Design a protein around this ligand. Structure first.
Ligand SMILES: CCCCCCCC/C=C\CCCCCCCC(=O)OC[C@H](O)CO
Ligand SMILES: CCCCCCCC/C=C\CCCCCCCC(=O)OC[C@H](O)CO
Ligand SMILES: CCCCCCCC/C=C\CCCCCCCC(=O)OC[C@H](O)CO
Ligand SMILES: CCCCCCCC/C=C\CCCCCCCC(=O)O
Ligand SMILES: CCCCCCCCCCCCCCCCCCCC
Ligand SMILES: CCCCCCCCCCCCCCCCCCCC
Ligand SMILES: CCCCCCCCCCCCCCCCCCCC
Ligand SMILES: CCCCCCCCCCCCCCCCCCCC
Ligand SMILES: CCCCCCCCCCCCCCCCCCCC
Ligand SMILES: CCCCCCCCCCCCCCCCCCCC
Ligand SMILES: CCCCCCCCCCCCCCCCCCCC
Ligand SMILES: CCCCCCCCCCCCCCCCCCCC
Length: 230
């Protein structure tokens, strides 16, 4: 409670934990193999985020990085979370549209580059270089978003209508919420430092719960996760 952002870390921990438990109960009894994949991916996402939020709340997922002549508090646990949860979210989208394996690997690999370069930027001690890493990570994000809007055209013709509808909604949610991340980083403690760490933590908490629990609620309530069966 010594850090003003503790309240948002505590709320994030609670919301990710509750979301995990809800998805775990909801997926109980699901037998359809396709739906099992979506429940597994979508329950793992907030479960991982729960552990990383808790690690930030308890102080383990925080480190001090010297730059700008200050000791800057950097929550590195965010990147350990996003390293696993962001490819999993992309996998949900890719499995919805029956994406080719080449496209899945492109997405997951670009996503690993996005998170890894974000982590390097977050830990870099030369201030100006932090924004070089931010730019590379943003380029990887833009590549991901490009693939989500222009890499699935060969699947549109054979796509079930409920699949197309649910995918279109999730793609819109993804573009809006994922785009906000580089902006928060750029203006917050890890970039220019014009927004204080407590407001940055609040912003990432709203984004993360929306991108994980909100996204999951939309996906797991849709008919698109079940194979077409009589
Ligand atoms: C924006 C994100 C909403 C955040 C939810 C966190 C808490 C977990 C969410 C619990 C959802 C409960 C729910 O919506 O239940 C409806 C369904 O009909 C019952 O099976
Ligand atoms: C996956 C969970 C992340 C564990 C990585 C780790 O603990 O190593 C970093 C070091 O402990 C922190 O300074
Ligand atoms: C001057 C800098 C030049 C280098 C900047 C690289 C830094 C990372 C930036 C973007 C990641 C790009 C991810 C690359 C993954 C592409 C995979 C691919 O090409 O997949 C196509 C295939 O047809 C299946 O869709
Ligand atoms: C590339 C697209 C443009 C966005 C990049 C902006 C980099 C901003 C870096 C300025 C932050 C340092 C200023 C400060 O010390 O407060
Ligand atoms: C320091 C204040 C501690 C009390 C905050 C309690 C907030 C819990 C409910 C938050 C509402 C979010 C629900 C979405
Ligand atoms: C101090 C608050 C700790 C976060 C709540 C723990 C998660 C509860 C999920 C049920
Ligand atoms: C506590 C850290 C949890 C991270 C492990 C998550 C592993 C994900 C496996 C599938 C991707
Ligand atoms: C200054 C040192 C700060 C430590 C940063 C460590 C960040 C590691 C995040 C990558 C996650 C790797 C997961 C390994 C499996 C567990
Ligand atoms: C870089 C690490 C990749 C994490 C994998 C998470 C699971 C999604 C692809 C199978
Ligand atoms: C303080 C100025 C640093 C800005 C560098 C940003 C690099 C963007 C493209 C490379
Ligand atoms: C059809 C597309 C639905 C629009 C998605 C709404 C975006 C709002 C994100 C928050
Ligand atoms: C200290 C006053 C400067 C704070 C400006 C914050 C602007 C961020 C909005 C984007």
């Amino acid at each position: 409670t010594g850090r003003p952002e503790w309240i948002w870390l505590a709320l994030g921990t609670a919301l990710m934990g509750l979301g995990t438990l809800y998805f775990l109960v909801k997926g109980m009894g699901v037998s359809d193999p396709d739906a099992k994949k979506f429940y597994a991916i979508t329950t793992l996402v907030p479960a991982i985020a729960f552990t990383m939020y808790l690690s930030m709340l308890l102080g383990y997922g925080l480190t001090m990085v010297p730059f700008g002549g200050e000791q800057n508090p950097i929550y590195w646990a965010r990147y350990a979370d996003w390293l696993f949860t962001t490819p999993l979210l992309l996998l949900d989208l890719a499995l919805l549209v029956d994406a080719d394996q080449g496209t899945i690997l492109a997405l997951v690999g670009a996503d690993g580059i996005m998170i890894g370069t974000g982590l390097v930027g977050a830990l870099t001690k030369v201030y100006s270089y932090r924004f070089v890493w931010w730019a590379i990570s943003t380029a990887a994000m833009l590549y991901i978003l490009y693939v989500l809007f222009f890499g699935f055209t060969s699947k549109a013709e054979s796509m079930r209508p409920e699949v197309a509808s649910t995918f279109k909604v999730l793609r819109n949610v993804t573009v809006v919420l994922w785009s906000a991340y580089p902006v928060v980083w750029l203006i917050g403690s890890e970039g220019a430092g014009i927004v204080p760490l407590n407001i940055e933590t609040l912003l990432f908490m709203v984004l993360d719960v929306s991108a994980k629990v909100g996204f999951g609620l939309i996906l797991l309530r849709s008919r698109a996760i079940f194979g077409e069966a009589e």
